[PDB]
Design a protein that fits this description.
The structure is a homodimer of 277-residue chains.
Chain A (H helix, E strand, L loop, with lengths): L1 E7 L2 E11 L3 E5 L10 H9 L3 E5 L16 H15 L4 E6 L1 H13 L4 E7 L19 H13 L1 H12 L2 H4 L6 H13 L2 H6 L1 H4 L14 E6 L11 H7 L4 E5 L6 H4 L1 H12 L2
Parallel strand pairs in A: 3-4, 3-5, 5-6, 6-7, 7-8
Antiparallel strand pairs in A: 1-2, 2-4
């Protein structure tokens, strides 16, 4: 199913989405370079607890259109605004994973929370990944992220292998918490995403969300793995909880960046306990 | 890389140029007697901000051919027109520094702004540097510029030393805002330019741009240093600000003429804020 969010030359930019269940609407917004199907273990848990689950694929990923324009959080948040207005959701919960935590913060900042009852940030980007003079809490200088973009442009298909090795801490989790088959499925999803988005999306990772955070005026959850090699907990979740002290806060012991799958039970128990309130 | 702009006897006239990054095209047009490389501090900032940066070396300067013909703003603007058509640049921003502010105004005036989104004038020549009866705001009468031509023809290599002393306000900035090594690099660039262009270019500095200014019909930025010893702000930017009151206007307190280097942080902040609109 698709929702049109804009036009690109002679084509419409359509985002693939699904809408399941009945109950309070929970919108799940996936990370790079996957799709709304990456939430399958959380979608199953939410459906089992009587929620309505809505998922969509960010432009350039999954089954959505693959434009060569719009890779920036104002456009990503305008796409989410179109989704939410089209579905006319009320009392909705927005749950972001990694890149999706940017859509949540920028959307609440720019459009407000009239349709929103709660937000959850899992494996967050916030507050601002660049290590700069004005942001000493950042994870790394911009040249580090520039090198990731260059590696995608050199051969995205080979880049995905090393990417998922650190995304899922495969040296620790392959064969225990994640099978070789589930990693292969992630690689297939990544390769199905657009070539342009694959290399342009990482330039948005280090967006500065510090001015968006004070506008988060609904109940919030921040959750992160202590073994996240991709987005270090010290420069993301721990600093984000200082910036958003009203949020509930959970650290999942030993979990990697790809904790929706490897630590599904720990994510699902924490997310449903938060949504029950 | 080179773009051919014409023929001189048995030779072609080729302008050196570079084309980096991706996104909205930003064309940077340098001043005398330097080259596209003099924008390195701005180029780095624009590339990091997601723009496509195009630089070229004016005929007779940098690594471009050194003809003994064409030192006038109609030719200079026709050279820019060839660069823009050769590259098919569209929705482009034109940024001039000092002599480059002549290309920007003369191009927009003669050719119009179908290809151009915005224009920026840094350390401008405009509106008309010659002091006359009809133009009392000019900086100096023709004899001053005839004296500069004659000094360049007498020994251009020695001329560059005192010229850069005033350009960068070295009595204030040497060893703080500009190193002796960076000044030496500027002298080397100047010595690499053509002998003929070195002495022909000063006659063009007092071109009258008063009829070109009313033809600027896209958003504009005018920025100048208040300590400019080369192009006094009271004969240039402050007069220009009255002739084009709709332009964003920035005075960089205490900055010299060579503010792309000495006050790069201020220039980059103003330029990126202007381009983000």
């Amino acid at each position: 199913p698709f929702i049109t969010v804009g036009q690109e030359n002679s084509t419409s930019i359509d985002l693939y989405y699904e809408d399941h269940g009945a109950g309070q609407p929970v919108v799940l917004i996936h990370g790079f370079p996957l799709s709304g199907h990456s939430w399958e273990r959380q979608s199953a848990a939410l459906l089992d607890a009587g929620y309505r689950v809505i998922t969509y694929d960010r432009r350039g990923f999954g089954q959505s259109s693959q434009p060569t324009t719009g890779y920036d959080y104002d456009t990503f948040a305008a796409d989410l605004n179109t989704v939410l207005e089209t579905l006319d959701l009320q009392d909705a919960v927005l749950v972001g994973f990694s890149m999706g935590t940017g859509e949540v913060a920028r959307y609440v900042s720019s459009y407000g929370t009239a349709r929103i009852a709660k937000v959850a940030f899992l494996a967050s980007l916030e507050p601002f990944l660049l290590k700069t003079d004005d942001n000493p809490d950042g994870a790394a200088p911009k040249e580090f992220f520039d090198g990731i973009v260059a590696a995608v442009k050199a051969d995205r298909y080979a880049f995905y292998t090393g990417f998922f090795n650190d995304f899922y801490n495969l040296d620790e989790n392959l064969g225990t918490r994640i099978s070789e088959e589930a990693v292969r499925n992630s690689w297939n999803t990544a390769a199905s995403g657009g070539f342009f988005a694959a290399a342009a999306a990482p330039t948005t990772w280090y967006t500065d969300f510090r001015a968006d955070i004070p506008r988060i005026d609904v109940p919030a959850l921040i959750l992160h793995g202590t073994g996240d090699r991709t987005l270090p907990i010290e420069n993301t979740a721990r600093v984000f909880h200082k910036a958003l002290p009203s949020a509930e806060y959970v650290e999942v012991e030993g979990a990697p960046h790809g904790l929706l799958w490897t630590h599904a039970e720990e994510v699902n128990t924490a997310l449903l306990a938060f949504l029950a309130k």
